[PDB]
């Protein structure tokens, strides 16, 4: 582990200090279907003509990025993603830009988001939940060793691959920071109390977010919900969670130590780091190496019906990808 991580760090640092840039062009891809939309961009399924490989191409409108003050965040996303390498991280295959947009071409997961299956099915059994959570525990161990904070764990950001393993996507808030940082970002249901109370925080907020995820996966709803974000923040800051009667003793005790407002006691944050989590009784069945190796049998495997089938995704209205004859925001995105 220590050894693996040391070498992992050497690999990351080389790409971090000398990022890949301009490794494809838009006309190399055929655009098939919108798989998701956001405030400053969309993601489309595309075909790479030269390989016939299918990819999820994230397209960001530079002007809208600038309007929403997401320049540095967007540079973080690309710079971090091109540098990392881990089985449960979606891979950035190509990045480029044109007059109008930024593009990140990432590995496609036709299985859809965890969110979709969780909502439909209602909830995951503890072993099912535990299987996903293990991959998150390992992924954060990896990311955190590189000085990266992820900052948006949720089911909407976890793709199910063709082996039923997960890919973490959406690095828009990921940041390489050795000290404390202060940006209010995340998703309301998943925010640590530190963030809400506008303190400087650190990687411990990812461990709290893990607690929220495990809970939601196993309960079928989040530990803190209301109709409005303000009502959610109140709940989170009160320091009170009710667990379903069906939750096992071990699960509840893991969640008490993750959803811990007190940082000196929150698991993942302590003197014994991630092993506090890994050696907990709830995980006692988990073979961590077999999970990393993808040798554990997945409790659910997505229904396959083609390398570019989109049936696990919802339908979104299509829009032209327009490229201006004028370069927008060249300077802001010079390093992209």
């Amino acid at each position: 582990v220590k050894e693996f991580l040391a070498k992992a760090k050497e690999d990351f640092l080389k790409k971090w200090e000398n990022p890949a840039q301009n490794t494809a062009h838009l006309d190399q891809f055929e655009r098939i279907k919108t798989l998701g939309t956001g405030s400053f961009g969309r993601v489309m399924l595309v075909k790479h003509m030269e390989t016939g490989n299918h990819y999820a191409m994230k397209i960001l409108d530079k002007q809208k990025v600038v309007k929403l003050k997401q320049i540095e965040h967007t540079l973080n996303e690309k710079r971090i993603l091109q540098a990392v390498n881990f089985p449960f991280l979606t891979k950035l295959e190509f990045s480029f830009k044109d007059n109008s947009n930024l593009y990140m071409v990432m590995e496609y997961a036709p299985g859809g988001e965890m969110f979709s299956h969780l909502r439909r099915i209602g909830r995951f059994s503890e072993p099912h939940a535990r299987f996903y959570a293990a991959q998150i525990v390992l992924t954060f161990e990896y990311l955190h060793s590189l000085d990266l904070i992820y900052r948006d764990l949720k089911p909407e950001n976890l793709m199910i691959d063709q082996q039923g393993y997960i890919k973490v996507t959406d690095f828009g808030f990921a940041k390489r920071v050795k000290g404390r940082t202060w940006t209010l970002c995340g998703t309301p249901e998943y925010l640590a109390p530190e963030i809400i109370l506008s303190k400087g925080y650190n990687k411990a907020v990812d461990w709290w977010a893990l607690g929220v995820l495990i809970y939601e996966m196993a309960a079928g709803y989040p530990p803190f919900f209301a109709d409005q974000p303000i009502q959610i923040y109140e709940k989170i800051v009160s320091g009170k969670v009710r667990f379903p009667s069906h939750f096992s003793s071990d699960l509840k005790d893991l969640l008490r130590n993750l959803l811990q407002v007190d940082l000196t006691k929150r698991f993942g944050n302590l003197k014994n780091g991630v092993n506090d989590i890994k050696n907990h009784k709830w995980f006692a069945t988990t073979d961590w190496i077999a999970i990393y190796q993808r040798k554990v049998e997945a409790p659910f495997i997505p229904k396959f019906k083609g390398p570019g089938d989109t049936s696990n995704f919802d339908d979104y209205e299509e829009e032209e990808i327009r490229v201006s004859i004028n370069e927008k925001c060249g300077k802001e995105f010079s390093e992209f």
Binding site: G38, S39, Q70, H73, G172, F173, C185, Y221
Partner: peptide
């Protein structure tokens, strides 16, 4: 039930990221 309250809530769909 808590499940009933959740499903009746306005936050069972995809949740947007927030930022300052």
């Amino acid at each position: 039930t808590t499940y009933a309250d959740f499903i009746a809530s306005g936050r069972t769909g995809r949740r947007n990221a927030i930022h300052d």
